Design a protein around this nucleic acid. Sequence first.
RNA 1: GGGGCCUGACUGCGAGGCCUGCAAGCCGAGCAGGGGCGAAAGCCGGGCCUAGUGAACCGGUGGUCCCGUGUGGAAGGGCCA
RNA 2: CUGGUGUUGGCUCUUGGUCGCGCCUGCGUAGGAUAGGUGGGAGCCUGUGAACCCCCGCCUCCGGGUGGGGGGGAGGCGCCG
RNA 3: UUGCCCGGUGCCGGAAGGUCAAGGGGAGGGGUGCAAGCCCCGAACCGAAGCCCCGGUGAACGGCGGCCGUAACUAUAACGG
RNA 4: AAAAAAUGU
RNA 5: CGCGGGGUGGAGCAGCCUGGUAGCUCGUCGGGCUCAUAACCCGAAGGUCGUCGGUUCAAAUCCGGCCCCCGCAACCA
Lengths: 50, 228, 93
Amino acid sequence: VRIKLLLECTECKRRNYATEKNKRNTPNKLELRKYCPWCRKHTVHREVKI
Amino acid sequence: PKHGKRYRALLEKVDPNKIYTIDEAAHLVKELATAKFDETVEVHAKLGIDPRRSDQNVRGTVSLPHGLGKQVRVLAIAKGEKIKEAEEAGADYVGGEEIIQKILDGWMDFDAVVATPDVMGAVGSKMGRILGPRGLLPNPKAGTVGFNIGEIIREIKAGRIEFRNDKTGAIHAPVGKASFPPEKLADNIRAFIRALEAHKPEGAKGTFLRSVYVTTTMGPSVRINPHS
Amino acid sequence: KVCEISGKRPIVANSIQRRGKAKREGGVGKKTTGISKRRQYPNLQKVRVRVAGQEITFRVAASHIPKVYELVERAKGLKLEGLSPKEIKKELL
RNA sequence: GGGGCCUGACUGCGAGGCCUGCAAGCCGAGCAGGGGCGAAAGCCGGGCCUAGUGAACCGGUGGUCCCGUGUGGAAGGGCCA
RNA sequence: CUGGUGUUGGCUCUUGGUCGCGCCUGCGUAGGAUAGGUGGGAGCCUGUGAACCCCCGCCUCCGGGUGGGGGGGAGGCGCCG
RNA sequence: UUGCCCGGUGCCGGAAGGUCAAGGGGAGGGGUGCAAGCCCCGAACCGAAGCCCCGGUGAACGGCGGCCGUAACUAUAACGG
RNA sequence: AAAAAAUGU
RNA sequence: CGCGGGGUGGAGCAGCCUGGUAGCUCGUCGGGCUCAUAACCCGAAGGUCGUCGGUUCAAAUCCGGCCCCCGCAACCA
């Protein structure tokens, strides 16, 4: 929402998605973090825009 | 007049309206290379990529097939036990810890300058705000940053040279002398054009080689063929 | 009015006014804000010709112009000299 | 209130009810998959909680076992997000 | 109202923006003079003709710069200042 | 007799530029074919009026406020801001 | 052919 | 949406293609010239050059990228 923003996730080896949110301003930027994947499962996750 | 009487009969032989190759440009620059010193090859290739945008920042390394025929005094910071593997790999000075103190107050240029991936927290301020004009400063790209350092030395001491791109996507990189025969000026011009159309920036447009020319020392080009 | 060689006349036609993204383009499709009744016309022009010694003009549609010229051609090898300008016309085919 | 490691702010579901005109709104054991903290029993399906939001109709991007106008493929649809 | 075309064809003149290429070009002030940037860089150009006169070709921020011709005779220029 | 103001608006002028339809134009991509190909998209730029902008215009549409400060036992203010 | 160049309980 | 174009003292506006100065005024403060006043005349308070990231020896400036304004042409399930 505004500065907050609508974020989506990637399976750093393909596609997959999760979807939550940032906050551009406040300590933010660059979004990589683990999360369990559907298309098989045991990785971390990128950021993007859609 | 406008140029060396020695220079001129070098053009009336290289028609600019005739498409030569890496054969008739390895054939006829044995007729254009007119002189009393051994001339190399000045094979350029102003790329079509853009310059100011980082999305097309060309920069690789080419292992020529038969060599420059022109030696190359390449050393190495080397650090640890590879202090000894850069001198059993073809090099004069290797591993001493910090020889950035003798090389401080006048120099008459040797040739190559490298340093490993752990001393790159203290290798850009000593002689890196110094050797960069003749861009010899240590970086993790151009083939001058790795622990295996002596293997980066034994190949450059075989016929290797260093390439990249200047303040106008202009590309130069040596095939070799004017002393290397028929298969010898073409075995090193093509193999060298196998590390440019391969390092080709994905966000660049059009043919990556805007025009290819094979020229010897101070003199007349041979507008060559980019495919043959 | 009525093109005399081809016969093409005025057929009813429409005026489609429509604002919005072409589906295939931006998206969402394109709405119509109106449609109306107009009338379409043949690109008729005027053209004179010899034929006998009397100048007879024709109301032909544009692209059917070098046609009459083809009429004035075959026209010759024929029983022509009857000063009926009137009659000169319709005669020709 | 403070600190250590981390991502469950999981997917696949959901016996069972609260409310209720519809339709929506709300709770969730437990199971399977694969993890996190943890010596361990265990806890975790976001926040101490009740506001933080808007059915469908057209459409954009991704994904994909799907339909593909005679036949093979595309054009364009479906569906998962 | 207007742009593209149709009706709609002759004759030169003139300018584009292009791009084909031969290959030719760039000055504020302080300056000896018209210094486009950044590297090479202490020596090349002449008997395949220099200093200077001359002509015309081109450009001019009209001072001045560049090339061919044609004379001549052996002089030019650059670090440095 | 008919004053002051052309900021907006209408209107008349005007252009250095902004923007802008069709069309031209073809860089490069893509659909297929064993290919010739046939097709689609189609980047630079050239593309009218128009509106933006520039001037002008009230017997063109309209408008023509205010609120401090300033003189003598106050008030008032031609006066200036 | 002294631009304009005020006053003075 | 995109092409533009624009923000820098308390308001005004130049420095915007050139890199190298943070200024030009109005307005407050002093101080100048007269015989004093007026009027001219000077020097200063004062701006993250909007923001942050950046190449440079150095940034208002050239690069970035976004918040924000205004012009237009277009979008609105």
